[PDB]
């Protein structure tokens, strides 16, 4: 809701910042195995449980 | 006809969420939030509304001059005129009878 606690809004800020694609220069590193960010989250699909 | 919305987050018709409908200089019909109606100061003896005393919500009495909150008489803003009159007459008559019962007791403490 619009009326939210600070602790809630801080969890939602971290949840927004973790929901980004992989930076592409990381795939060029030697012995790199990560092809994409495997921990993506859509708002309608998986809920935060906060 | 224009329709209005609450201006605050409270969506319920509670005692503190009463609204009036007001037309603004912009030609608009908006909701104006109405404060709860003040109750009248009442007599401590009979409970009737005291004359000459402003009807305010309790915190508003702190911010108003003294002539609004009292009446120039004994027990002015606390008791009504008739209850003060009855207190005065009762006090006088009862103390008079106390003197009468004392002198009478001294009259029966010297003959019986």
């Amino acid at each position: 809701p619009s009326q939210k606690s600070f602790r809630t809004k801080q969890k939602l800020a971290k949840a927004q910042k973790q929901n980004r694609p992989l930076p592409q220069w990381i795939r060029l590193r030697t012995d790199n195995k990560i092809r994409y960010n495997a921990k993506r989250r859509h708002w309608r699909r998986t809920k935060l449980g906060i | 006809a224009q329709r209005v919305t609450y201006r605050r987050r409270n969506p319920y018709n509670t005692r503190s969420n009463k609204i009036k409908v007001v037309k603004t200089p912009g030609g608009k019909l908006v909701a104006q939030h109405v404060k709860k109606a003040a109750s009248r100061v009442k007599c401590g003896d009979c409970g009737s509304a005291l004359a000459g005393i402003s009807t305010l919500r309790p915190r508003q009495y702190a911010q108003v001059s003294k002539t609004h909150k009292t009446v120039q008489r004994a027990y002015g803003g606390s008791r009504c005129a008739n209850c003060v009159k009855e207190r005065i007459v009762r006090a006088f008559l009862i103390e008079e009878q106390k003197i009468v019962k004392r002198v009478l007791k001294e009259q029966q403490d010297k003959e019986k």
Binding site: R7, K11, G49, I50 | -
Partner: protein, 86 residues
């Protein structure tokens, strides 16, 4: 109406985030965590749940201080500073 219609009436959280373990097991009305037992002084743990001990024990976090006790012990719990060689 105990299935789909009744499942539509779920908007009142029984649990919120715990301050000790951050898990969303803090019962609001009981004021207790079903996971770590907060605000009790001790941590909630049972011998009938060994996997639960696995999930939250030493080594599952940072060990920001126990990391180095072995390395300080191996040097006899040194006091002072290293001396530069001539």
């Amino acid at each position: 109406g105990k299935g789909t219609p009744s499942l539509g009436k779920r908007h009142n959280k029984s649990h919120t985030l715990c301050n000790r373990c951050g898990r969303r097991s803090f019962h609001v009305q009981k004021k207790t965590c079903s996971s770590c037992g907060y605000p009790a002084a001790k941590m909630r743990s049972h011998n009938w749940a060994l996997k639960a001990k696995r999930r939250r024990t030493t080594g599952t976090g940072r060990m920001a201080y126990l990391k180095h006790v072995t390395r300080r012990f191996k040097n006899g719990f040194q006091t002072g500073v290293a001396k530069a060689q001539t």
